[PDB]
Tab-separated table of C-alpha atoms and ligand atoms in Angstrom:
chain	number	residue	atom	x	y	z
A	27	UNK	CA	-66.190	-13.822	5.854
A	28	UNK	CA	-68.544	-16.742	6.894
A	29	UNK	CA	-65.640	-19.147	8.754
A	30	UNK	CA	-63.476	-18.361	11.779
A	31	UNK	CA	-60.879	-20.779	12.045
A	32	UNK	CA	-59.113	-21.017	15.769
A	33	UNK	CA	-55.841	-22.713	15.378
A	34	UNK	CA	-55.083	-24.691	18.878
A	35	UNK	CA	-53.056	-26.791	19.820
A	36	UNK	CA	-55.315	-29.873	20.456
A	37	UNK	CA	-56.694	-29.200	17.135
A	38	UNK	CA	-58.132	-26.411	15.289
A	39	UNK	CA	-61.820	-25.424	15.333
A	40	UNK	CA	-63.572	-24.021	12.678
A	41	UNK	CA	-66.564	-21.641	13.606
A	42	UNK	CA	-69.020	-21.249	10.912
A	43	UNK	CA	-70.453	-17.737	11.363
A	44	UNK	CA	-72.556	-17.138	9.209
A	45	UNK	CA	-74.488	-20.106	9.801
A	46	UNK	CA	-74.861	-19.285	13.213
A	47	UNK	CA	-76.161	-15.630	12.333
A	48	UNK	CA	-78.760	-17.465	9.887
A	49	UNK	CA	-79.863	-20.088	12.737
A	50	UNK	CA	-80.114	-17.261	15.563
A	51	UNK	CA	-81.537	-14.396	13.486
A	52	UNK	CA	-79.627	-11.999	15.903
A	53	UNK	CA	-76.301	-10.449	16.875
A	54	UNK	CA	-76.806	-8.969	20.395
A	55	UNK	CA	-77.114	-12.336	22.216
A	56	UNK	CA	-73.306	-13.221	21.091
A	57	UNK	CA	-72.339	-9.737	20.805
A	58	UNK	CA	-73.341	-8.505	24.012
A	59	UNK	CA	-71.015	-5.274	23.839
A	60	UNK	CA	-72.479	-4.650	20.032
A	61	UNK	CA	-71.012	-6.583	16.743
A	62	UNK	CA	-67.195	-6.832	16.799
A	63	UNK	CA	-64.546	-8.419	18.623
A	64	UNK	CA	-65.854	-10.151	22.028
A	65	UNK	CA	-63.710	-8.921	24.604
A	66	UNK	CA	-61.792	-11.776	26.691
A	67	UNK	CA	-62.658	-14.613	24.082
A	68	UNK	CA	-60.532	-17.298	25.064
A	69	UNK	CA	-60.413	-21.169	25.994
A	70	UNK	CA	-62.519	-20.619	29.228
A	71	UNK	CA	-65.353	-18.565	27.397
A	72	UNK	CA	-65.368	-20.761	24.452
A	73	UNK	CA	-66.222	-23.653	26.616
A	74	UNK	CA	-68.497	-22.008	28.535
A	75	UNK	CA	-71.372	-19.550	27.053
A	76	UNK	CA	-68.996	-18.385	24.087
A	77	UNK	CA	-69.314	-21.712	22.284
A	78	UNK	CA	-70.064	-25.311	24.039
A	79	UNK	CA	-72.443	-24.111	26.833
A	80	UNK	CA	-74.997	-23.028	23.832
A	81	UNK	CA	-74.686	-26.072	22.343
A	82	UNK	CA	-75.435	-27.695	25.375
A	83	UNK	CA	-78.617	-25.645	26.314
A	84	UNK	CA	-79.850	-25.664	22.916
A	85	UNK	CA	-79.117	-29.490	22.320
A	86	UNK	CA	-77.609	-28.979	19.133
A	87	UNK	CA	-74.413	-28.196	17.801
A	88	UNK	CA	-70.737	-29.750	18.801
A	89	UNK	CA	-70.416	-30.585	22.727
A	90	UNK	CA	-67.611	-33.388	22.590
A	91	UNK	CA	-64.282	-32.321	22.225
A	92	UNK	CA	-63.371	-33.906	18.995
A	93	UNK	CA	-66.502	-32.550	17.453
A	94	UNK	CA	-65.256	-28.939	17.550
A	95	UNK	CA	-61.126	-29.837	17.610
A	96	UNK	CA	-59.897	-31.460	14.505
A	97	UNK	CA	-56.913	-31.736	12.685
A	98	UNK	CA	-54.489	-33.272	15.646
B	108	LIG	C1	-75.776	-10.515	11.773
B	108	LIG	C2	-75.314	-10.530	13.363
B	108	LIG	C3	-73.724	-10.497	13.856
B	108	LIG	C4	-72.844	-9.637	13.384
B	108	LIG	C5	-73.241	-8.217	12.323
B	108	LIG	C6	-71.915	-9.840	13.842
B	108	LIG	C7	-70.739	-9.562	13.527
B	108	LIG	C8	-69.151	-10.000	13.827
B	108	LIG	C9	-67.981	-9.301	13.525
B	108	LIG	C10	-67.808	-8.174	12.808
B	108	LIG	C11	-66.737	-10.372	13.932
B	108	LIG	C12	-65.477	-10.259	13.597
B	108	LIG	C13	-64.626	-9.271	14.666
B	108	LIG	C14	-63.256	-9.256	14.671
B	108	LIG	O1	-62.580	-9.755	13.639
B	108	LIG	O2	-62.854	-9.151	15.864
B	108	LIG	C15	-67.748	-11.542	14.471
B	108	LIG	C16	-66.866	-12.288	15.293
B	108	LIG	C17	-67.551	-13.088	15.954
B	108	LIG	N1	-69.166	-13.132	16.156
B	108	LIG	FE1	-70.327	-12.495	15.500
B	108	LIG	N2	-71.804	-11.447	14.393
B	108	LIG	C18	-73.054	-11.694	14.146
B	108	LIG	C19	-73.762	-12.533	14.966
B	108	LIG	C20	-73.056	-13.489	15.648
B	108	LIG	C21	-73.757	-14.904	16.311
B	108	LIG	C22	-75.121	-15.151	16.450
B	108	LIG	C23	-72.795	-15.193	17.024
B	108	LIG	C24	-72.761	-16.354	18.084
B	108	LIG	C25	-73.319	-17.670	17.761
B	108	LIG	C26	-71.536	-14.488	16.830
B	108	LIG	C27	-70.371	-14.803	17.275
B	108	LIG	C28	-68.972	-14.300	16.840
B	108	LIG	C29	-67.968	-14.929	17.500
B	108	LIG	C30	-67.501	-15.868	18.788
B	108	LIG	C31	-66.970	-13.918	16.872
B	108	LIG	C32	-65.175	-14.123	17.082
B	108	LIG	C33	-64.938	-13.173	18.264
B	108	LIG	C34	-63.387	-12.876	18.544
B	108	LIG	O3	-62.670	-13.163	17.777
B	108	LIG	O4	-63.572	-11.740	19.457
B	108	LIG	N3	-71.650	-13.728	15.933
B	108	LIG	N4	-68.923	-11.407	14.274
B	109	LIG	C1	-63.567	-31.440	27.467
B	109	LIG	C2	-63.744	-31.647	25.889
B	109	LIG	C3	-62.843	-30.716	25.505
B	109	LIG	C4	-61.269	-30.312	25.379
B	109	LIG	C5	-60.400	-31.082	26.349
B	109	LIG	C6	-61.092	-29.102	25.164
B	109	LIG	C7	-59.731	-28.408	25.226
B	109	LIG	C8	-59.173	-27.193	24.690
B	109	LIG	C9	-57.982	-26.773	25.093
B	109	LIG	C10	-56.875	-27.510	25.878
B	109	LIG	C11	-57.992	-25.338	24.067
B	109	LIG	C12	-56.910	-24.483	24.385
B	109	LIG	C13	-55.631	-24.447	23.115
B	109	LIG	C14	-54.949	-25.536	23.269
B	109	LIG	O1	-54.212	-26.049	24.243
B	109	LIG	O2	-54.923	-25.991	21.861
B	109	LIG	C15	-59.272	-25.189	23.828
B	109	LIG	C16	-59.560	-24.000	23.162
B	109	LIG	C17	-60.757	-23.590	22.480
B	109	LIG	N1	-61.600	-24.703	22.583
B	109	LIG	FE1	-61.668	-26.620	23.484
B	109	LIG	N2	-61.727	-28.463	24.278
B	109	LIG	C18	-62.901	-29.089	24.328
B	109	LIG	C19	-64.277	-29.003	23.675
B	109	LIG	C20	-64.645	-27.709	23.094
B	109	LIG	C21	-65.982	-27.861	22.322
B	109	LIG	C22	-67.104	-29.048	22.197
B	109	LIG	C23	-65.378	-26.612	21.311
B	109	LIG	C24	-66.501	-25.936	20.206
B	109	LIG	C25	-67.916	-26.184	20.544
B	109	LIG	C26	-64.378	-26.389	22.082
B	109	LIG	C27	-63.622	-24.522	21.345
B	109	LIG	C28	-62.561	-24.312	21.625
B	109	LIG	C29	-62.289	-22.971	21.089
B	109	LIG	C30	-62.851	-21.973	20.029
B	109	LIG	C31	-61.194	-22.670	21.694
B	109	LIG	C32	-60.114	-21.777	21.211
B	109	LIG	C33	-60.330	-20.500	22.034
B	109	LIG	C34	-59.415	-19.338	21.808
B	109	LIG	O3	-58.964	-19.068	20.610
B	109	LIG	O4	-59.037	-18.332	22.893
B	109	LIG	N3	-63.147	-26.782	22.878
B	109	LIG	N4	-59.948	-26.425	24.014
B	110	LIG	C1	-66.971	-19.722	18.932
B	110	LIG	C2	-67.933	-20.753	19.562
B	110	LIG	C3	-68.681	-21.526	18.881
B	110	LIG	C4	-68.318	-22.333	17.912
B	110	LIG	C5	-66.873	-22.913	17.707
B	110	LIG	C6	-69.419	-22.915	17.049
B	110	LIG	C7	-69.404	-24.334	16.473
B	110	LIG	C8	-70.276	-24.847	15.649
B	110	LIG	C9	-70.343	-25.519	14.739
B	110	LIG	C10	-69.025	-26.643	14.258
B	110	LIG	C11	-71.589	-26.188	14.077
B	110	LIG	C12	-71.908	-27.168	13.445
B	110	LIG	C13	-72.198	-26.541	12.527
B	110	LIG	C14	-72.705	-27.909	11.280
B	110	LIG	O1	-74.053	-28.365	11.336
B	110	LIG	O2	-71.832	-28.398	10.185
B	110	LIG	C15	-72.327	-25.206	15.056
B	110	LIG	C16	-73.893	-25.473	15.225
B	110	LIG	C17	-74.693	-24.631	16.022
B	110	LIG	N1	-74.203	-23.764	16.878
B	110	LIG	FE1	-72.487	-23.266	17.211
B	110	LIG	N2	-70.642	-22.974	17.743
B	110	LIG	C18	-70.080	-21.480	18.821
B	110	LIG	C19	-71.102	-20.886	19.392
B	110	LIG	C20	-72.357	-20.962	19.518
B	110	LIG	C21	-73.266	-20.097	20.346
B	110	LIG	C22	-72.665	-18.859	21.450
B	110	LIG	C23	-74.246	-20.475	20.098
B	110	LIG	C24	-76.008	-20.220	20.826
B	110	LIG	C25	-76.189	-19.200	21.628
B	110	LIG	C26	-74.611	-21.504	19.195
B	110	LIG	C27	-75.347	-22.000	18.534
B	110	LIG	C28	-75.544	-23.083	17.518
B	110	LIG	C29	-76.937	-23.860	16.804
B	110	LIG	C30	-78.025	-23.109	16.826
B	110	LIG	C31	-76.076	-24.695	15.930
B	110	LIG	C32	-76.887	-25.043	14.651
B	110	LIG	C33	-76.351	-24.215	13.390
B	110	LIG	C34	-76.643	-25.351	11.967
B	110	LIG	O3	-76.456	-26.352	11.836
B	110	LIG	O4	-77.502	-24.710	11.290
B	110	LIG	N3	-72.999	-21.936	18.488
B	110	LIG	N4	-71.723	-24.273	16.386
C-alpha cells in the first residue's frame, strides 16, 4: 500500500504515502504514537499539522484547496 485515498464531498484527496516516507526518511514525525492509524485524523487535522500545515512550513507540497482536492 503506497497511496491512501480520502473520499470527500469537495473532491477526493490522494495521499502518496510511500513518497512521503521516502522524502522524510522517518516515521515518528507523522506517527507520534508509533506507526499505524493516527487517532483523531479528520478535516481539521489534515488542514493543520496532519497535512497542509507541513506543506506550508516546508514550502513544498499542495497548499491550495484544488491541489489536494480533485474530482469534483
Ligand atoms: C517508514 C515510516 C512509516 C511507517 C512504518 C508508516 C506506517 C503507516 C501505516 C501502517 C499506515 C496505515 C494505518 C491504518 O491503516 O490505519 C499509515 C498511514 C498513514 N501514515 Fe504512515 N508510516 C510511515 C511514514 C509516514 C510519514 C512520514 C507520514 C507523514 C508525512 C505518514 C502519514 C500517515 C498518514 C496520514 C496515514 C493515515 C492515518 C489514518 O488513516 O489514520 N506516515 N502509515
Ligand atoms: C482552503 C482550501 C481547502 C478547502 C476549502 C478544503 C475543504 C475540505 C472540506 C470541506 C473537507 C471535509 C470533507 C468534505 O466536506 O468533503 C476537507 C477534508 C480534507 N481535506 Fe481539505 N480543504 C482545503 C485544503 C486542503 C489541502 C491543501 C489538503 C491537502 C494538503 C486537504 C486535505 C484534506 C483531507 C485529507 C481531508 C479529509 C480528512 C478526513 O478524511 O477526515 N484539504 N477539506
Ligand atoms: C495525509 C496528509 C497529507 C497529504 C494529503 C499530503 C499530500 C501531498 C501530495 C499530493 C504531495 C505531492 C506529491 C507529488 O509531488 O506528486 C505531497 C508532497 C509532499 N508532502 Fe505531503 N501530504 C500530507 C502530509 C504531509 C506531511 C505531514 C508532511 C511534512 C511533515 C508532508 C510533506 C511533503 C513533502 C516533503 C512533499 C514532497 C514529496 C515529493 O514530491 O517527493 N506532507 N504531499
